[PDB]
Design a protein around this ligand. Structure first.
Ligand SMILES: O=C(O)CC[C@@H](NS(=O)(=O)c1ccc(COc2ccc(/C=C3\SC(=O)NC3=O)cc2)cc1)C(=O)O
Length: 435
């Protein structure tokens, strides 16, 4: 594509919006920027000669544009944006701009849970093979900051939102890892509309990788599959140990992995299937599986002291993700579970199954605290903030217990993002968790 002379409007700042600004400027196009927030992050790092409008959308600017670049954080359904679309004004996102320029194969990963782990993993597989790889998208750097002529492979985490505005992706290997309820505040046509957005990732992909255990990950020549008991990539359980297997051949005893748990093992399978489709050597891909330590805020033990494990799973920002943490979870004594924040209109009831017995306590906070507490009121306390919940639970903690921040919600009602929320839990854990 050629943008010269075009009237360009970027909706949304932050890192991503700033990368879009720099993208256009470096191509000799001065965009204008709008953001519905009065002081969006990065405002102060915006260059002085870029026109900006904050606090709302400017329909004069939008209806004047030749191209609208919408941040994933604004709904295409927003009245101002659908007015523009009705006018035949072209609307894209950062990812779409990336895909038009990228000069290396792209491995594209989406999913309600696991997508950051799989993306990171595939990145580490490439790195183990000596491949110059750019890893990012919806994590790490925004995609436009990855763009580099010497890159030999890109591995992009993509959200449903990014996919809605992307049309030029032709992934060398693409996956939806799973589809469980999330973002319903952005999908008024419910689960199928959310699913429909993620399905876009498969269009023109050279290989598709689907989850044989989640029918919703399949499109409406076949896809490669991964699964627990079925799928081209699957698990084989022999006698307390577990193997990764490709079409009946053993490829890795999971005792060599530093990650644990069925769902991490199916993440490994997904990563391997993607790495294989991308043409990465198998040996170095397996080697990456054994060195990978996991991501911060992803079921991350921040403190083990005095018989108590404090676990930061702050990246659990949906129900499926918390359920992943709770399902099969071994706790010696009492589980003290922190739930709360912005539940994005999710049904929390699927969590109820995991909260029976004498060994669970709930500490529910933020915007949907009352709804979370209502899962089992008898064993629940509700506060306003996570710090209050931590100071409430800490005196109760006994040798053998677990403290688990796995909130099933976004942090955005009270925090900058789930990282700040994990960081704050980590600091509090260390204060509250020794004498
Ligand atoms: O961190 C959390 O606790 C939750 C993350 C959570 N992720 S996520 O909503 O999928 C998400 C998507 C893109 C980004 C980064 O990029 C953005 C730029 C601008 C905006 C807000 C804008 S733009 C505008 O014009 N008016 C706005 O209020 C939001 C995001 C951050 C989060 C979620 O999964 O619930």
């Amino acid at each position: 594509a050629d943008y010269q002379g075009k009237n360009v409007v970027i909706i949304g700042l932050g890192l991503t919006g700033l990368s879009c600004v720099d993208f256009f400027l470096a191509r000799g196009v001065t965009p204008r920027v709008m953001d519905t927030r009065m002081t969006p992050p990065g405002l102060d790092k915006l260059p002085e000669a870029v026109e900006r409008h904050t606090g709302s959308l400017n329909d004069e600017w939008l209806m004047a544009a030749d191209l609208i670049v919408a941040s994933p954080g604004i709904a295409l359904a927003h009245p101002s944006l659908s007015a523009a679309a009705d006018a035949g004004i072209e609307i894209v996102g950062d990812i779409e701009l990336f895909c038009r320029e990228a000069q290396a194969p792209i491995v594209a990963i989406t999913g309600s849970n696991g997508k950051s782990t799989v993306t990171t993993l595939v990145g580490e597989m490439a790195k183990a093979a000596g491949v110059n790889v750019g890893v990012g998208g919806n994590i790490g750097l925004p995609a436009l900051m990855l763009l580099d002529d010497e890159c030999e492979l890109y591995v992009l985490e993509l959200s449903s939102f990014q996919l809605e505005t992307t049309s030029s992706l032709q992934a060398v290997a693409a996956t939806i890892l799973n589809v469980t309820e999330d973002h319903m505040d952005r999908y008024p046509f419910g689960l199928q509309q959310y699913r429909a957005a993620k399905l876009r990732i498969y269009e023109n992909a050279k290989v598709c990788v689907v989850n044989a255990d989640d029918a919703l990950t399949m499109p409406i020549e076949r896809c490669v599959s991964f699964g627990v008991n079925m799928g081209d990539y699957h698990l084989n359980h022999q006698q307390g140990e577990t193997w990764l297997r490709v079409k009946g051949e053993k490829v890795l005893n999971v005792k060599e992995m530093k990650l644990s748990g069925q769902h991490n093992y199916t993440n490994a399978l997904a990563a391997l299937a993607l790495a294989d489709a991308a043409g990465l050597p198998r040996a170095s891909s397996l080697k990456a599986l054994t060195t990978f330590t996991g991501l911060p805020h992803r079921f991350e033990v921040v403190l083990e002291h005095n018989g108590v494990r404090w676990i930061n799973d702050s990246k659990a920002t949906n129900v499926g993700s918390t359920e992943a943490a709770l399902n099969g979870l071994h706790v010696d004594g009492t589980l003290h579970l922190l739930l709360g924040g912005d539940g994005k209109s999710a049904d929390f009831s699927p969590l109820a199954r995991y909260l029976n017995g004498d060994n669970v306590r709930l500490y529910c906070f933020g915007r949907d605290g009352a709804q979370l507490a209502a899962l089992r009121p008898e064993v629940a306390e509700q506060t306003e903030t996570m710090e209050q919940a931590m100071r409430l639970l800490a005196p109760r903690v006994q040798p053998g217990d677990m403290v688990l921040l796995s909130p099933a919600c976004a942090s955005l009602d009270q925090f900058k993002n789930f990282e700040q929320r994990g960081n704050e839990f980590a600091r509090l854990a260390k204060e509250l968790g020794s004498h």
